[PDB]
């Protein structure tokens, strides 16, 4: 979708908006048999052709042939924390996906699914808490960008997931943070190379 959006609803962009049933675009763009083109009269502009149940421009749960897809047809792929979208058979919208179970692996293994979201840490999966590994002194560790866990409210125990402690839960595999995540006690950010880049004070 290259370039700025007009951010004004108009009948003729591909998008359905208040006061219009469908929108397949202006005549030159509209491959829809279900719908009336933007350069076509008001009052039909913007509205479903009669006897036509729905338009694919309203959503994925309409067929090309202007029928509602039947219930439990796939309208959306799995997310990290969510299962397939299925059509409900009464609308062309793809209804909200349902959640995968809590403590399912999310965000490149980094956090965990709670109520269909991404939150918290893969630490909490094992009943640990996420901490920050922190500097010996002024001097930047690789472990600054590791996922680091501690025993709950005992920050003394902070260590990298791959450390010799936590071997029970993580077996010596380091798990790195996601690029962009804060590091060295919010003095930094992780770059693509998983180094902690110092960042300005006083923002």
């Amino acid at each position, epitope marked *: 979708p*290259v*370039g*700025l959006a007009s951010g004004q609803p108009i009948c003729g962009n591909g998008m359905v908006e208040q006061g219009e049933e469908c929108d397949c675009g202006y005549s030159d763009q509209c491959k829809d048999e279900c719908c009336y083109d933007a350069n076509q009269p008001e009052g039909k502009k913007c509205k479903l052709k009669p006897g036509k149940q729905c338009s694919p421009s309203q959503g994925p749960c309409c067929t090309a042939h202007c029928a509602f897809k039947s219930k439990t047809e796939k309208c959306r792929d799995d997310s990290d924390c969510a299962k397939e979208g299925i059509c409900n058979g009464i609308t062309a919208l793809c209804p909200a996906s349902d959640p995968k179970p809590n403590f399912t692996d999310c965000n490149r293994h980094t956090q965990v699914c709670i109520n269909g979201q991404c939150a918290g840490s893969i630490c909490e999966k094992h009943g640990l808490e996420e901490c920050t590994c922190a500097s010996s002194d002024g001097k930047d560790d690789k472990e600054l960008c590791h996922v680091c866990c501690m025993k709950k409210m005992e920050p003394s125990t902070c260590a990298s997931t791959g450390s010799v402690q936590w071997n029970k839960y993580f077996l010596g595999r380091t798990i790195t943070l996601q*690029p*962009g995540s804060p590091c060295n006690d919010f003095r930094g950010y992780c*770059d*693509v*190379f998983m180094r902690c*880049r110092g960042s300005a004070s006083g923002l």
Partner: antibody, heavy 120, light 108 residues
Framework: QVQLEESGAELARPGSSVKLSCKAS????????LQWVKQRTGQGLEWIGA????????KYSQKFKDKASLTVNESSSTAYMHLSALASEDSAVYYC?????????????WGQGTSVTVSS | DIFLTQSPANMSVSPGERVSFSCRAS??????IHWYQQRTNGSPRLLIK???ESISGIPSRFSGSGSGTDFILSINTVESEDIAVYFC?????????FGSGTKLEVIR
């Protein structure tokens, strides 16, 4: 002014190895990732790897792990790539380039390239 | 890896006209992509970073936009020294990957 000067063209026998060099000046060598890129005549760019001259930490493309070795001399502000077990598919131009504008770096400055030729 | 395609492979334009190169990412990289110009026997040269943003000393006739999976580099007024191959490169994850480039011809 920020500049990276590279060693000149190598001829190398099949099975041998080369040491390619990149000399940094114009900035603090030890504050920037330094990257290596292969291009066969005339064809696409291919990212080999990167090294961080402070601690010498290195990232490698999986494809090049058995090929390339990255080091630095921090004193001379020079970076090195060893190419080993050289075959003809290694004949190519090799650039070093500085990583900049974090956190997802562009390559803001380039050496002239070193042309490696692998032939008997 | 994250893969890039460039379209078209070559492109041909009269001087002072406008040209637009297209770059497709195989997953959502956000804005993290940059553009390079390589003239014959030259090094790559950084044009745009992140994918709208200007580089000091680059002619202003070079611009870009895009986001998610789709990106465009544009030269508003082509000159004949703009003959080169143009590459998109993604920084979103390493190993960094390049589109295979579009070559610019100038018509005369």
């Amino acid at each position: 002014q920020v500049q990276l000067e590279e060693s000149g063209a190598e001829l190398a026998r099949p099975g041998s190895s080369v040491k390619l060099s990149c000399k940094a000046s114009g900035y603090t060598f030890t504050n920037y990732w330094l990257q290596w890129v292969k291009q066969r005549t005339g064809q696409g760019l291919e990212w080999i790897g990167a090294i961080y001259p402070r601690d010498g930490d290195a990232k490698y493309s999986q494809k090049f792990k058995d090929k390339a070795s990255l080091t630095v001399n921090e004193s001379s502000s020079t970076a090195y790539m060893h190419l080993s077990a050289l075959a003809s598919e290694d004949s190519a131009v090799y650039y070093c380039a500085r990583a900049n504008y974090g956190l997802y770096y562009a390559m803001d400055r380039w050496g002239q390239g070193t042309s490696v030729t692998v032939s008997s | 890896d994250i893969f890039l395609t460039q379209s078209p492979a070559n492109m041909s334009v009269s001087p002072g006209e406008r040209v637009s190169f297209s770059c497709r990412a195989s997953q959502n990289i956000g804005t993290n992509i940059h553009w390079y110009q390589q003239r014959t026997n030259g090094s790559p040269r950084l044009l745009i970073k992140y994918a709208s943003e200007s580089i000091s000393g680059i002619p202003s006739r070079f611009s870009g936009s895009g986001s998610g999976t789709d990106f465009i580099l544009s030269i508003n007024t082509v000159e004949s020294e703009d003959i080169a191959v143009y590459f998109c490169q993604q920084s979103n994850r390493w190993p960094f990957t390049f589109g295979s480039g579009t070559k610019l011809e100038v018509i005369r």
